[PDB]
From a paper:
One specific mechanism used by nairoviruses is the production of a deubiquitinating enzyme, termed the [name], that disrupts the innate immune response. Interestingly, the nairoviral L segment also encodes a viral homologue of the ovarian tumor protease ([name]) at the N-terminus. Instead, the [name]’s primary function appears to be the reversal of post-translational modifications by ubiquitin (Ub) and the Ub-like protein interferon stimulated gene product 15 (ISG15). Each [name] possesses a seven-stranded beta sheet as the core feature, with five major alpha helices framing the rest of the structure.
Viruses in the Hughes orthonairovirus species possess an additional 26–30 amino acids in the middle of the [name]. To assess how this additional sequence influences the structure of vOTUs in this subset of nairoviruses, a crystal structure of FARV [name] was solved to 2.22 Å. While possessing the familiar core domain and secondary structure features, the protease possesses extended α3/α4 helices that are connected by several intervening residues. Thirteen residues could not to be built due to a lack of well-defined electron density in the crystal structure, and those that could be modeled possess high B factors, suggesting this region to have a high degree of flexibility. This is facilitated by hydrophobic packing between Ile86, Val105, Ala82, and the aliphatic portion of the Arg108 sidechain. Additionally, FARV [name] possesses a potential steric hindrance to efficient binding with the presence of Arg170. Removing this region reduced activity towards Ub-AMC by almost 60%, suggesting that this motif could play a significant role in Ub binding.
Numbering used by the authors:
A (entry chain A), B (entry chain B): 2 to 88, 102 to 183
The structure:
Amino acid sequence: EDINWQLFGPNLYTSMVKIAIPDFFERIRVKGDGNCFFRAFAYLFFDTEEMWDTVKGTALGYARQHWSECHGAKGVYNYRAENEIKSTENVTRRGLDLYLEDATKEGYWGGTDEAEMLASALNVTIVIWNVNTDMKVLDVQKFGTDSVPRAFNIVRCGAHFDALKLINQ
Amino acid sequence: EDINWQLFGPNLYTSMVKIAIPDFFERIRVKGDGNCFFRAFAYLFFDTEEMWDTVKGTALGYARQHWSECHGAKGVYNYRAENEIKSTENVTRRGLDLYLEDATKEGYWGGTDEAEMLASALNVTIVIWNVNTDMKVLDVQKFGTDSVPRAFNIVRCGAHFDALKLINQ
C-alpha cells in the first residue's frame, strides 16, 4: 500500500504505481457535463455535487489572488499573453485576465489546472488517477503532500472525472 | 472529419473527439522497448524504425539549444534543479543538465516531452491518440497547427506507442 511519490513540480508529485482502482476504491459517478471535475471534488469535499459552483468559485478566486502560484494555468496563459503584446509585470497580469475570460464561461471544462488551485486554496491533497475504460491506472499525480488515504481521490477517464472513496475506510 | 482543437499549452492542442482508430488508420507496430515513441515517429518520418536514434538525437539536441521552449520537460526539471540548489538563470541551466542526465540513458522512455521537441525542431505536427485496449479513443493531443491528415499520427496504449497511417491517403 506504500507508494513512492517523486517530485514533479511545485506541490505536485507523480508515481509509477499501477493498480486497478476497483480493488481499493468505490467510484461515485457525477453528472457528465463540463463541470464534472468540480462536481467530483464537491462530492468528496462537501458531500454533494451541487456545490460544484462553490468549488469553481474557490478555484477562480484563488487564481485572482495567487496567480504566480498557479503553475499549470499560468504556464499556458502567461506564454500566450506575451504573444498578444507584440501584436514582466504586465504580461502575467494579462495572462490572468485571459485565464479568467475562459474559466468564467459556463462552458469551461475544469481539470488539472484547477485541482492545483484547490489543493493550495484549501490546504488539501488531491490525487488524479488517469485510467482507461477498464479502470486500470495509466498514470497518477497528486497535488499536496498527504497519503492516498488522507487525500481526495478523483478518477479521470478521457475528458470525464468521477469521485473515488477508499473501500476499507 | 472536422475536429475542434482547444489550445492547451504552447503549440499544444487537445480535443474530445471520440473515434474508433481502425476506421480511419492502419496501425503499424514498433518494437516494444523504451524507444517505442522514437521508433513510431522514425517509422512515419523516415520510413524506418531504425532511425529512432537520429530522432532521439534530434529531440535532445533541440532541447540543448531551446530549453526554454521545452515546456513539458522544463516544468519538471527546472523545478527539480531549484530544489537541488536549496539543499533565475543558474536554475534553468541546471534543469536542462538534469533532463539530459535522464534522457541520454539507454533505458530512457521517450514520450510527450519529446513529441513537443520534435514538433518544434522539425516544424511538423504530431498527434498522440490515447486509446484503450480495444483501440477506442480516450482523448487526443496535437503538437503543432496542421490538421490530422497533414500530421504524423501516433497511437498510445498505456506505456506503449505505435505508428498510425491514414487509410484515405
